[PDB]
């Protein structure tokens, strides 16, 4: 049906690859199987090599490199890709260890990005960018500061963009009258070789004056619309500079991204809750 072909200026060497978004099932990473198409004159003695990379930039800290030689040799999709090509069609087969940093980049390249590089030379160029990605498989926080503040989330797993609902319970016995309630979202993006980032904040001047109870639900939504101008914002894997989502929530060595909900009063005791922000499997 659909398969991606890449070539260099001379085009003697072509790489056919089925997918370009590798799903980490957390036990078996979708194996990387591709086909190299060459000619005899352009190679003759020089063998055909291909490489998988996990290049981390910001510094080029490739946490892993493996070499598989298309020619000489050392799967059905490979079968069908080969049958159309003939003698100079040679498979390469890389297997990603399950424990690699997923594909995350930083909006100004930087971050984590896999890659398949295909070349031909005598002794161990086509640049095919791939990525690692994951699919989406009841938070409750308390604080007795008086000012009893309880927050709860309907569910922990929310897809990118879907609104998140927060139940707030404010019991105020005190004489200290509230000014605001802010339900904010914090995106922690730790660069490992953990910075707070405000992405959404539904502030309402809901004041619960002495000896009172406040019980209502807020709905907050972190979106890239207002986050376009946030330096260090962890975006998801960018293929050839497409437009990407927010760096999803890692499910555990590169950049570690987590997401929490913070319910802050301005009196100002608060709470914090985590949630998952990964796309669902289509």
């Amino acid at each position, epitope marked *: 049906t659909r398969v991606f072909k890449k070539s260099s200026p001379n085009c003697k060497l072509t790489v056919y690859l089925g997918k370009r978004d590798f799903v980490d099932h957390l036990d078996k990473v979708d194996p990387v199987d591709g086909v190299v198409l060459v000619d005899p004159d352009y190679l003759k003695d020089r063998k055909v090599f291909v490489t998988l990379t996990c290049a981390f930039r910001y510094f080029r800290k490739d946490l892993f490199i493996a070499n598989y030689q298309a020619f000489p040799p050392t799967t059905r999709l490979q079968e069908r890709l080969l049958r159309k090509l003939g003698q100079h069609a040679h498979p390469f087969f890389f297997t990603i260890p399950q424990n690699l940093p997923c594909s995350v980049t930083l909006q100004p390249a930087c971050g984590v990005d896999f890659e398949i590089r295909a070349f031909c030379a005598k002794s161990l160029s086509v640049r095919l960018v791939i990525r690692k990605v994951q699919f989406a498989p009841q938070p409750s926080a308390e604080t007795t500061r008086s000012l009893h503040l309880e927050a709860s989330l309907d569910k922990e797993l929310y897809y990118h963009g879907e609104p998140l609902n927060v139940n707030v319970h404010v019991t105020n016995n005190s004489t200290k009258t509230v000014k605001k309630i802010k339900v904010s979202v914090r995106q922690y993006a730790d660069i490992c070789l953990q910075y707070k980032c405000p992405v959404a904040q539904v502030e309402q001047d809901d004041q619960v004056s002495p000896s009172s109870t406040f019980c209502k639900v807020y709905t907050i939504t972190p979106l890239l619309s207002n986050n376009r101008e946030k330096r260090g914002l962890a975006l998801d894997g960018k293929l050839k500079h497409e*437009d990407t989502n927010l760096a999803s929530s890692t499910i555990v060595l590169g950049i570690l991204v987590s997401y929490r909900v913070k319910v802050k009063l301005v009196v100002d005791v608060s709470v914090e809750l985590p949630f998952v922000l990964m796309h669902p499997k289509p």
Partner: antibody
Amino acid sequence: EVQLVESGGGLVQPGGSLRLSCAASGFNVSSSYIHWVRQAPGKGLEWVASISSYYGYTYYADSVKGRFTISADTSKNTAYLQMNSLRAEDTAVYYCARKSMYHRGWGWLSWVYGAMDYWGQGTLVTVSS
Amino acid sequence: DIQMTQSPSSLSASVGDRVTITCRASQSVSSAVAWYQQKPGKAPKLLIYSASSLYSGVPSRFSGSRSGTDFTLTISSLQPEDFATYYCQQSYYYPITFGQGTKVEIKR
């Protein structure tokens, strides 16, 4: 099930204004390209505007750039098209449609602007002095 | 913008006809086209995407194909119920441009 409801259709003098609300059920405005289309009386369709909240992109047809303005409310999961300076030619039956940005294989596709497969039911927008 | 012209502006047809409807774009298109079948009074329905796909629920008797920039919509058996206008529209560039209908008439 995914559906849209277009509301806010009634008479309005030329040079006046109206507001159309597209209530989207079954999906989010941040995970779908929302397109406001219309159809003149006894003619074919015409694409008016289209938005995507997640990336905050807006695109108007050259005839409704500025005279119409589209946005959305994610809390209510709704799309809003404020129609300014409605004119006689603007008379039509207006539709709302949605393109799921899913099924790239993993996540969103930011460069498809795909075909709008789920239309509403059509609300008449009149203009008459 | 792109003038997604469609021809014929009107074609005669009856039961069993294999109608061919052509849509030619002013500028290059990249398999991004959809042909919408509107009955008089109702709202359109998706028929073609990717210039060759079949949206779920679209009757198999409809088909679309690409022979370059000229997108072909073929209704092998134009059944009695499929009497409506057919407009082609490319979803590649913006602002989207619609065709000018292929009024599916009846012959007597």
